[PDB]
Amino acid sequence: QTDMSRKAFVFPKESDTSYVSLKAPLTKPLKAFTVCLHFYTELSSTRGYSIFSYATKRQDNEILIFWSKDIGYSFTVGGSEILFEVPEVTVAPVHICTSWESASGIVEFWVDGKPRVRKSLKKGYTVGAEASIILGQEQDSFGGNFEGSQSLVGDIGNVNMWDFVLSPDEINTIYLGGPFSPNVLNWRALKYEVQGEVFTKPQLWP
Amino acid sequence: QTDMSRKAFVFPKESDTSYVSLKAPLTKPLKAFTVCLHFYTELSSTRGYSIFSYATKRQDNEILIFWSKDIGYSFTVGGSEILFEVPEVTVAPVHICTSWESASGIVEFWVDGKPRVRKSLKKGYTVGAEASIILGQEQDSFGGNFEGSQSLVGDIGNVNMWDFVLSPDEINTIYLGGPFSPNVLNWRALKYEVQGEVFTKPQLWP
Amino acid sequence: QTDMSRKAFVFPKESDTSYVSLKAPLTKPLKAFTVCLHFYTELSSTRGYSIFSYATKRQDNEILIFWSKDIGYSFTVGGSEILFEVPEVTVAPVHICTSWESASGIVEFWVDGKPRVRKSLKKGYTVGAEASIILGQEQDSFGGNFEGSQSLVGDIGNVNMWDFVLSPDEINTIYLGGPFSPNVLNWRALKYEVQGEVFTKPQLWP
Amino acid sequence: QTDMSRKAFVFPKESDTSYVSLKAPLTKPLKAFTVCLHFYTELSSTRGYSIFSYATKRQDNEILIFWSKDIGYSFTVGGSEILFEVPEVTVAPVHICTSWESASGIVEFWVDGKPRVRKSLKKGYTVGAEASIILGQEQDSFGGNFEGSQSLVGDIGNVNMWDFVLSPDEINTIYLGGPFSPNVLNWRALKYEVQGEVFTKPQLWP
Amino acid sequence: QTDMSRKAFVFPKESDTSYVSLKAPLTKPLKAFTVCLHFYTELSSTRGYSIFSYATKRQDNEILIFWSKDIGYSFTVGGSEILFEVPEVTVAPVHICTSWESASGIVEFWVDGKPRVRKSLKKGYTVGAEASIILGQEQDSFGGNFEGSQSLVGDIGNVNMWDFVLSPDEINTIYLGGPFSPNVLNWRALKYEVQGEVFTKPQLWP
Amino acid sequence: QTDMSRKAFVFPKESDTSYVSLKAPLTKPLKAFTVCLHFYTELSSTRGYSIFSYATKRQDNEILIFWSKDIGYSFTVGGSEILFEVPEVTVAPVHICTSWESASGIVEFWVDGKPRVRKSLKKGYTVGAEASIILGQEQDSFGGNFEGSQSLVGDIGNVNMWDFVLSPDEINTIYLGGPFSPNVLNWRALKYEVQGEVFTKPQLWP
Amino acid sequence: QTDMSRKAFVFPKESDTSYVSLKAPLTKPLKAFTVCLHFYTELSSTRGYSIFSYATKRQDNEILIFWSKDIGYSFTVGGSEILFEVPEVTVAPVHICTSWESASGIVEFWVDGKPRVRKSLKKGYTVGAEASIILGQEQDSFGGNFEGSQSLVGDIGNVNMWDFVLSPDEINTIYLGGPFSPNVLNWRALKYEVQGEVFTKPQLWP
Amino acid sequence: QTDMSRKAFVFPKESDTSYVSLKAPLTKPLKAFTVCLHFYTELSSTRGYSIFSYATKRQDNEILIFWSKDIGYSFTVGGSEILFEVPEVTVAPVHICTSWESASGIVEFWVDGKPRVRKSLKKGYTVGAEASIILGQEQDSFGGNFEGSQSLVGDIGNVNMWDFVLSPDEINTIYLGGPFSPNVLNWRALKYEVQGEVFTKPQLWP
Amino acid sequence: QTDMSRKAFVFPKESDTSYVSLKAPLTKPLKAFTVCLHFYTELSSTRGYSIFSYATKRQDNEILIFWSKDIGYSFTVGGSEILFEVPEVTVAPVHICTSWESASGIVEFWVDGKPRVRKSLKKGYTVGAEASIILGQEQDSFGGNFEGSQSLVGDIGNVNMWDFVLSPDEINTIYLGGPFSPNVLNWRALKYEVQGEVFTKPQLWP
Ligand SMILES: [Ca+2]
Ligand SMILES: [Ca+2]
Ligand SMILES: [Ca+2]
Ligand SMILES: [Ca+2]
Ligand SMILES: [Ca+2]
Ligand SMILES: [Ca+2]
Ligand SMILES: [Ca+2]
Ligand SMILES: [Ca+2]
Ligand SMILES: [Ca+2]
Ligand SMILES: [Ca+2]
Ligand SMILES: [Ca+2]
Ligand SMILES: [Ca+2]
Ligand SMILES: [Ca+2]
Ligand SMILES: [Ca+2]
Ligand SMILES: [Ca+2]
Ligand SMILES: [Ca+2]
Ligand SMILES: [Ca+2]
Ligand SMILES: [Ca+2]
């Protein structure tokens, strides 16, 4: 487990080969989760891109966070998709947190510390534990079949995951940088494998 | 009775069946009132929605606070309506307080701590005591006849009601989160009944 | 009827002449009652004081709520007395309710929404209907013989009286603020007479 | 003398009936004046309205402060007009102070503490002392000939008048709140008569 | 007139010479007032200090707010004094408001948004308008005769004064930082002169 | 069976004759049990009192939960005593659960949802099924020989009994009042007999 | 291998014969370790007790965690002792982690997620791996010479051991119960042997 | 430059030889500064210790932050001292910030985000740039003459220095851990030398 | 070597002859660099201009920073170009820092302390040490062939160059003006030669 504090993966070219695969000690199938990350890309006005790709062997889009061009953030669980439309997008680094819960299907999407309206997705589902988590690519088989037109170009980091819905006050601390302890995926205790053109650099954002 | 402090009702799907009914053991009919609430919805650019629906057996729109698409807040008492145009609407949680006084018919509207101009409505009327108070739906009968195209989708909370017109100083206190004692409807002491897909969650707003 | 909402009687000096007399439209003898009031004084560590003095021509302490120095609340009906010991007192406004029922002699005493243990007093007694109800003084005859060392110095308000025992849920709504209608003594519809140095001011408490 | 402090006149419906007439003690003719007031209305996008209408039997527009649609503040003295163009107008309470000095004809117009450029009007004129001062209406005769399309709808208050030009420092105190003593017309010592549907309510602005 | 917003006067050493003199062009003598301020000092356990000194040529203690060691706040008008005993005192900035009304003599005292019990002082008195208002020192003559053993050491700011008794709602607004307009002494519109070692610094309190 | 839900037995006087006897549908001898209740009394600092008195014809203290002054909860099974000492006691309603298992003699004691340390008592013993269960008194014969100095004065309710050790999770749901189904003694299906001055009143605790 | 998840060893009586012996699948002598556990006991105010006794055939206090009465946690490695003093003790379940590194000799001690100051012990030592690990007793030979005056009475569980110093992040995840993999001694894969009066019960603590 | 982020120096034993020497790229003499650090020690109950020692060849205590037993923090500049008395000290990590300004001599002292009252020290002085900055020891000559009785035993970290007084908002960001850029001494870009028995470890505090 | 602190080269006319030539005492070929500068120009609306032209004998655009009209900053290394689109412009002094690194080709570009996204250029290239560095012109031979339509009109200063990629923290200090030491090209130790109409004046930007 490597401490990635202050460091980001840099995907500086559009390619289908550059990815990092993140390994989770996930012994339990998820009835709920939170995932937070920073990313920074100019693609938003050019095309869509994968922000966070989680696949199980049953389902290649088991959790996917996707920027869809001229629409905004696609969020999907279990192949069902919900849109958090963003009309005005700016070239600045952006922090997101996204939370889903099976018991209600309530999705919380948060951008730069501001909540979106809570929406319903995949009530009663469960996310499988045996999963491939990939940054930089959108995967259509378990660990592969990326499309370069869906790759990330630029930076991603502070990828942190919990198997529970963070409260709003917790997510506020995350955005401010208060202390927290992720229990599914910890940027401060990252297990990862790097493939292709990916560089680790000091994070650009504060 | 339940202390809903820091909690909101989440209405995460469009439906004709999700609602909460709030009980007031109100004895005297209302010659005046104030109602204050937080709500959060993205619908404001899509369609109209009921924020706060108070009906009596004579009158289904006995007090109704309604967002009307491309206009703003619609306020009606005893079935008569006045409008507070909102030319720019922005996706953020909004606090509103509204007061009506029979003796003058003056309606007061405050949004996020700012008053609208005092308008006149239903001078000399009296609001019936035997009431059905419904959140998340607009009712066209005493306890029913909802239209799904008028449901609230999103959050409503801090619902407080007084049988008198609050002064501006009091309303400033409410918005700042000073202490107060609502004497008709009280979030700290709420008696309510839930139907359909409705969930109690930590409030998104401070 | 005068609506005393948000107003309190202020007794800002020690005297034996400042009092207010409250006129009850009461003619049936009380087989039970609840009396609730809010009050605020600095005397509690200095000396005892009358909170609520109800006298009948046969009995000057027919209902008396009395603070007794370094003891607590003294509650007495028909001259008999019981104590609700209070080992620590804090300088904040205090709201009390107390209920007595002849059919059981059970006294309930409630301070700031917390019940005291139920105690037995004057089972089968009756409280006279023709009463002199006085605030600010303790009376040893029908409307007179006040002692300045027993006067309330400070504020008293929200004085409500019922000829029946309120349930705990009702007492909770009294404390928190919700709707209620007293049928013996109503703050919203008070009949009172002021004598001496007494002022009506905005209540300090919410 | 009536203290209207913290109170406003409310004109909640369009009519020619609703007006209030203010009585100045003024004996001397005015060689200079300042008039300051708070008003709040949503009409500014819809039609013109009279803000302040000092009239004399010789001259119905002896001093008139008038909102002209899509133009701004019409300021006229002795029937001669000047405009302070306002290209962007926003629905919020607005404080104005206006000064006229005969010895130079200089008009100072101030809005929310910002000066407009000084303009020349009626140099060497004199404003008649025997005057009818009306709020809520524009008068074309010494006490009448109102027109509904010129009536104020909304709130007006803090109407103070001096027979001299306040300095910028003084006007800054008027806007921010400090101590001042008007000698022609004092809101804290006002003589007025109400006609029609006009109400006195707590001012919405600080 | 300086906008002292977010600034405080810092009195960092004991002296008989560091003071600021606050200028009010007050014409009417005061039948009532409210004064509110923040201050911060460690002296409270060591010795008494003047918080707010208002003197006339007739009366050096016309308004004085004083800390008395091991007693608490001393409030005096016209030389007559009342105490608001503070048995536990903590090393933090403290906001106070205090109100006096001649007509009743009622003194209100508020500390960090909690009211003290209303007390009586100098009923029927009138506070002189020609006044010397000094922060940091205690006057024994008009503008002079300071005692270093009574000087404030530390910070004072947000000094606002009204010539009327603020309601509890208003004071709650003040303490919460709601908008308000002081009509005697305005921190946003302060005219003052500084003598000796006194500095303007960013306020330590929110 | 009477549904005692929301009701408590009230023992408002010290007496040797006020008691209720609860009838158990028990048939097997108890090799284990759990007993849970709320009670409320002021005696704790004044004298001991019997909380729960279970006697078989062989053994008057076959299960006894007893408060002993200056010590705490006496728990006895088969006549043998262990103490869960309580140095700091506060006058508030207290919930307890206590469990015993013959297979190990482990006693679990729980106060207000917090476990005491597990202690050992009467391993291999058997509790008789023919039992007089009495609330309000300590019985020294099968159903009698009460003592005034050991009577409960105050309120006892939610008396539930299981013939097995509840897990911590179950006891947590009991403390939260969740769905639970007792099978030796059931408040929601209570067979009982009332003797002397005992009253049924709404429970004071939530 | 037994998964002891949610279970604790209960030592419910004082004895010198009740112990559980834990078998470590280890051969490498330890240059560093971390040990974590929950325990719950009332002894702390009565006497000291062994929490964790690790003995090699040369050294019976090779690692020992010992509560020292009125002092606190004794920690000793290779027979050298350090104390982490705890002046006041609450009767509650307590989680501790302690780490030692030979290279620096730094001892970390953590109670309920709060670190003690790092201290030095046995720099350059090495702990033998051919070790007997006993819970419930202090051992003065490789498997015996227990003293009942040093036995644990109560509960001990979640006993996990690493041959490396856990980071503060990892320890936070232990205390929060996140995922972790012990490599010397694992509660989820415990190999153990029970002697005397010891029971396996559901853990009382979360 | 070494990024010490999340690392602390550990001084686990008392010695007169363990220190870290910090080098500032500072060439202009300081007219103002801010010093912020975390430290963690148990010595505070037991003896005094140096926290931060800044010497110039003319002046061994040109800046000294010192804990003096029973007194509290000693802050000295140019060899003059002021005390920030601390009556009760608890064993927890403490963050401090301290500021000095020549022009006023105002010292700000901040503990765990709470400001002390501003004090005066060395008005008009200046601090030399030819300086030796040592952690862990108190120095009485430019680089040496330590005392073991004044050494820090424990952890020190997050040492940042500015040549200007940080505003209260800035210091609040430092305490919260918002982004900041030092310009004299920078933990993220630290130039230091380690001497004696000292270790670098992950910081125990968040 | 001249200390140019607070000074700037002023190019007050368009010409093909005004330039200043900067000499780097550089011996190693540059595997990486950072260049930071301030410039101020009106040209941005009107035509492109050379900000910083670095040419080796092989390559007249070995490093060039160029404003390209309507596009933004052209950055080119070894004659290959990447664009940082700037769709909105303000006529103000602008600080840029740009870094390149052969080992990845990653270019960083920073404007007024805000990073652009990292882009790849000239991976594995090497930049010749023996170069002419010209401010005010674009150079198409080694030291000449300037085009007036590409000259800088206005101000250039604070030109600092490093042969390594500054971290974000460092670049932040550069923008804030924290202390730094450039090892290729140092404004505070500049070797330069001036040709044509160029002046040195106090820098307009702070
Ligand atoms: Ca795909
Ligand atoms: Ca896919
Ligand atoms: Ca309807
Ligand atoms: Ca409808
Ligand atoms: Ca009496
Ligand atoms: Ca008496
Ligand atoms: Ca007209
Ligand atoms: Ca006219
Ligand atoms: Ca004096
Ligand atoms: Ca004096
Ligand atoms: Ca007995
Ligand atoms: Ca017995
Ligand atoms: Ca041993
Ligand atoms: Ca031993
Ligand atoms: Ca020294
Ligand atoms: Ca020394
Ligand atoms: Ca070229
Ligand atoms: Ca060219």
Q: Which two tokens stand for residue D187?
A: 């809101």
Q: Are the beta carbons of E140 and E60 closer than 8 angstroms? A: yes
From chain A, pick out residues whose CB is under 8 angstroms from the CB of G176: 181, 183
Q: Which residues make Cβ contacts (< 8 Å) with residue H101, sequence separation at least 6?
A: H31, H32, H165
Phi-psi region of D154 (alpha: psi -120 to 50; beta: other; left: phi over 0): left
Q: φ and ψ at B150, to 5 degrees?
A: -115, 5
Strand H72-77, strand H59-68: pairing: antiparallel
Which residue is associated with the tokens 């006044």?
E131
Cα distance from N-terminal residue to C-terminal residue, chain G: 23
Report CA torsion sign: B17, B18, B24, B25.
positive
What three-state secondary structure class fits I83?
Answer: strand
Q: Which residues make Cβ contacts (< 8 Å) with residue C119, sequence separation at least 6?
A: C82, C84, C106, C107, C109, F12
Q: What is the distance between the alpha carbons of residues D172 and D186, in angstroms, rounded to a whole number?
A: 18
**Domain total in chain E:** 1
Q: Which two tokens stand for residue E180?
A: 């308000």
For residue H174, give the H/E element and its range.
helix H168-176
| Residue span of the structural domain in which F200 resides | 1-206
Cβ contact (<8 Å) for B167 and E172?
no
Compare CB distances from E178 to B167, B172, B179 and report the shortest one's residue. Answer: B172
Which residue is associated with the tokens 């330069």?
I192
Quick count: other Cβ atoms within 10 Å of Cβ E14? 16
Q: What is the distance between the alpha carbons of residues A136 and A184, in angstroms, rounded to a whole number?
A: 20
Starting at the edge strand found earlier in the chain, the sheet holding F72-77 runs F80-85, F72-77, F59-68, F49-56, F131-135, F19-22, F192-195
Q: Which two tokens stand for residue I159?
A: 């030109």
Query: How far, in Å, are E101, G85, G142, H86, H175 from residue H44 at the CA level?
Result: 52, 14, 40, 11, 22
Residues constituting chain H? 206
Q: Which residues make Cβ contacts (< 8 Å) with residue I135, sequence separation at least 6?
A: I9, I19, I20, I22, I52, I53, I152, I156, I159
* DSSP code string of A105-118: -EEEEEETTEEPPP
Query: How far, in Å, are H172, I12, I17, I50, I60 from residue I147 at the CA level?
Result: 52, 16, 9, 10, 13
Q: What is the distance between the alpha carbons of residues E93 and H192, in angstroms, rounded to a whole number?
A: 39
Q: Are the beta carbons of A100 and A109 closer than 8 angstroms? A: no
DSSP assignment letter at G172? H
What three-state secondary structure class fits F43?
Answer: helix
Strand G94-101, strand F80-85: pairing: unpaired
Q: Which two tokens stand for residue B63?
A: 């007090």
What three-state secondary structure class fits G59?
Answer: strand
Please return the burial class of G43, using the count of CB atoms within 10 Å of its CB with bins 0-12, 13-18 and 19+.
Answer: middle
Tabulate helix, strand, coil % of chain C (nearest 5).
10, 45, 45
Q: Where are the beta strands (DSSP E) in E71-184?
A: 72-77, 80-85, 94-101, 106-111, 114-115, 119-120, 132-135, 154-162
Which residue is associated with the tokens 């910090």?
H22
* DSSP code string of H18-63: -EEEE-----SPBSEEEEEEEEE-SGGGT--EEEEEEEETTEEEEE
Q: Are the beta carbons of E101 and E86 closer than 8 angstroms? A: no
Q: Are the beta carbons of H101 and H32 closer than 8 angstroms? A: yes
Cα distance from N-terminal residue to C-terminal residue, chain H: 23
Q: Which residues make Cβ contacts (< 8 Å) with residue H45, sequence separation at least 6?
A: H89, H91
What three-state secondary structure class fits H139?
Answer: coil
Neighbours of chain D (3+ CB pairs under 8 A): B, E
Q: In 3D, which of C133, C142, C164 has the Cα closest to residue C32?
A: C164
Q: In 3D, which of B118, B149, B143 has the Cα closest to residue B54?
A: B143
Ligand number with the minimum distance to the CA of C56: 5
What three-state secondary structure class fits A133?
Answer: strand
Q: What is the distance between the alpha carbons of residues A129 and A161, in angstroms, rounded to a whole number?
A: 13
Q: Which two tokens stand for residue F175?
A: 């403390």
CA-based nearest distance G109→chain F, Å: 24
Q: Are the beta carbons of C50 and C137 closer than 8 angstroms? A: yes
Q: Which residues pair with D8 in a beta bridge?
A: D201
Quick count: other Cβ atoms within 10 Å of Cβ B114? 12
What are the binding residues of C?
A: 60-61, 138-140, 150
HSE-CB at B191 with a 13 A cutoff on CA atoms is: 15
Ligand number with the minimum distance to the CA of E60: 9
Quick count: other Cβ atoms within 10 Å of Cβ F181? 9
What three-state secondary structure class fits I154?
Answer: strand
Compare CB distances from F41 to C85, C114, C117 and report the shortest one's residue. Answer: C117
Q: Are the beta carbons of F10 and F158 closer than 8 angstroms? A: no
Q: What is the distance between the alpha carbons of residues B157 and B2, in angstroms, rounded to a whole number?
A: 13
Q: What is the distance between the alpha carbons of residues G23 and G159, in angstroms, rounded to a whole number?
A: 12
Q: Are the beta carbons of I204 and I8 closer than 8 angstroms? A: yes
Q: What is the distance between the alpha carbons of residues I145 and I151, in angstroms, rounded to a whole number?
A: 12
What three-state secondary structure class fits I172?
Answer: helix
CA-based nearest distance A88→chain B, Å: 12
Neighbours of chain B (3+ CB pairs under 8 A): A, C, D, E
* DSSP code string of E30-81: BSEEEEEEEEE-SGGGT--EEEEEEE-SS-TTSEEEEEETTTEEEEEETTEE
From chain H, pick out residues whose CB is under 8 angstroms from the CB of A179: 206
From chain G, pick out residues whose CB is under 8 angstroms from the CB of H204: 108, 115, 118, 168
Q: What is the distance between the alpha carbons of residues B64 and I193, in angstroms, rounded to a whole number?
A: 79
Q: What is the distance between the alpha carbons of residues I46 and I52, in angstroms, rounded to a whole number?
A: 19
Mutation target among C11, C17, C49, C204 for the E interface, most CBs of E within 10 A: C204
Q: Which residues pair with B25 in a beta bridge?
A: none
Q: φ and ψ at I53, to 5 degrees?
A: -105, 120
Q: In 3D, which of G66, G69, G39 has the Cα closest to residue G50?
A: G66
Q: Which residues make Cβ contacts (< 8 Å) with residue D167, sequence separation at least 6?
A: none
Residue C174 alpha carbon to ligand 6 centre in Å? 30
Name the packing angle between helices E168-176 and B168-176 (round to 10°). 30
Which residue is associated with the tokens 């002209």?
D68
HSE-CB at I32 with a 13 A cutoff on CA atoms is: 15
Q: Are the beta carbons of E123 and E105 closer than 8 angstroms? A: yes
Q: Which two tokens stand for residue B162?
A: 């007084």
Compare CB distances from C5 to B164, B178, B180 and report the shortest one's residue. Answer: B164
Which residue is associated with the tokens 């430092």?
H174
Q: Which residues make Cβ contacts (< 8 Å) with residue H54, sequence separation at least 6?
A: H61, H62, H63, H64, H127, H131, H132, H133
Q: Chains G vs F: touching, with 3+ CB pairs under 8 Å?
A: yes
Q: Which residues pair with A53 in a beta bridge?
A: A64, A134
Phi-psi region of D187 (alpha: psi -120 to 50; beta: other; left: phi over 0): alpha
State the amino acid at position C78 in one-letter form: G
Tabulate helix, strand, coil % of chain F (nearest 5).
10, 45, 45
Cα F154–F158–F162 angle (5° rounding)?
Answer: 130
Please return the burial class of C123, using the count of CB atoms within 10 Å of its CB with bins 0-12, 13-18 and 19+.
Answer: middle
Q: In 3D, which of I44, I35, I48 has the Cα closest to residue I133?
A: I35
Mutation target among A2, A174, A175, A176 for the H interface, most CBs of H within 10 A: A176
Chain B residue whose CA is closest to C178: B183
Q: What is the distance between the alpha carbons of residues A184 and F160, in angstroms, rounded to a whole number?
A: 41
Residues constituting chain F? 206
Q: Which residues pair with A133 in a beta bridge?
A: A22, A54
Please return the burial class of D90, using the count of CB atoms within 10 Å of its CB with bins 0-12, 13-18 and 19+.
Answer: exposed
State the amino acid at position H10 in one-letter form: V
Cα B115–B121–B122 angle (5° rounding)?
Answer: 145
Distinct helix (H) and strand (E) counts, chain F: 1, 15
Q: Which two tokens stand for residue B200?
A: 């109690």
Q: Are the beta carbons of A168 and A55 closer than 8 angstroms? A: no
Rg (CA), chain E: 15
Report CA torsion sign: G68, G73, G76, G81.
negative
Compare CB distances from F202 to C85, C104, C168 and report the shortest one's residue. Answer: C168
Q: What is the distance between the alpha carbons of residues B149 and E38, in angstroms, rounded to a whole number?
A: 52
Ligand number with the minimum distance to the CA of H81: 15
What three-state secondary structure class fits G163?
Answer: coil
Which residue is associated with the tokens 């002189």?
E128
CA-based nearest distance C195→chain E, Å: 15
* DSSP code string of I19-82: EEEEPP---S-BSEEEEEEEEE-SGGGT--EEEEEEEETTEEEEEEEEEETTTEEEEEETTEEE
Q: Which residues pair with E12 in a beta bridge?
A: none
Q: Which two tokens stand for residue I146?
A: 């300037």
Q: In 3D, which of E53, E79, E73, E70 has the Cα closest to residue E145?
A: E53
SS3 assignment for chain D: CECCCCEEEEECCCCCCCEEEECCCCCCCECEEEEEEEEECCHHHCCCEEEEEEEECCCCCCEEEEEECCCEEEEEECCEEEEEECCCCCCCCEEEEEEEECCCCEEEEEECCEECCCEECCCCCCECCCEEEEECCCCCECCECCCHHHCCCEEEEEEEEECCCCCHHHHHHHHHCCCCCCCCECHHHECEEEECCCEEEECCCC
Q: Are the beta carbons of B91 and B204 closer than 8 angstroms? A: no
Q: Which residues make Cβ contacts (< 8 Å) with residue F21, sequence separation at least 6?
A: F132, F133, F134, F135, F143, F192, F193, F195
Q: Are the beta carbons of A101 and A120 closer than 8 angstroms? A: no
Cβ contact (<8 Å) for E105 and C12?
yes
For residue F170, give the H/E element and its range.
helix F168-175
Q: Are the beta carbons of D104 and D123 closer than 8 angstroms? A: yes
Cα F174–F179–F185 angle (5° rounding)?
Answer: 65
Mutation target among G173, G174, G188 for the A interface, most CBs of A within 10 A: G173
Q: Which two tokens stand for residue A87?
A: 């009309």
Q: What is the distance between the alpha carbons of residues C4 and D21, in angstroms, rounded to a whole number?
A: 33
Chain H residue whose CA is closest to G104: H199
Q: Which residues pair with H67 in a beta bridge?
A: H49, H73
Q: In 3D, which of E20, E28, E53, E24 has the Cα closest to residue E128?
A: E28
Report CA torsion sign: F165, F169, F174, F180.
negative
Quick count: other Cβ atoms within 10 Å of Cβ C3? 12
Which residue is associated with the tokens 């040369």?
G58
Compare CB distances from H118 to E12, E91, E92 and report the shortest one's residue. Answer: E12
From chain B, pick out residues whose CB is under 8 angstroms from the CB of E181: none
Residues constituting chain B? 206
Cβ contact (<8 Å) for B25 and C179?
yes
Cα distance from N-terminal residue to C-terminal residue, chain I: 23
Question: Per-residue b/e over I27-41, b at no fewer than 16 CB within 10 Å?
Answer: eeebebbbbbbbbbb
What three-state secondary structure class fits I168?
Answer: helix
Q: Which two tokens stand for residue C168?
A: 């705990």
HSE-CB at G109 with a 13 A cutoff on CA atoms is: 20
Q: Which residues make Cβ contacts (< 8 Å) with residue D15, sequence separation at least 6?
A: D148, D151, D196, D197
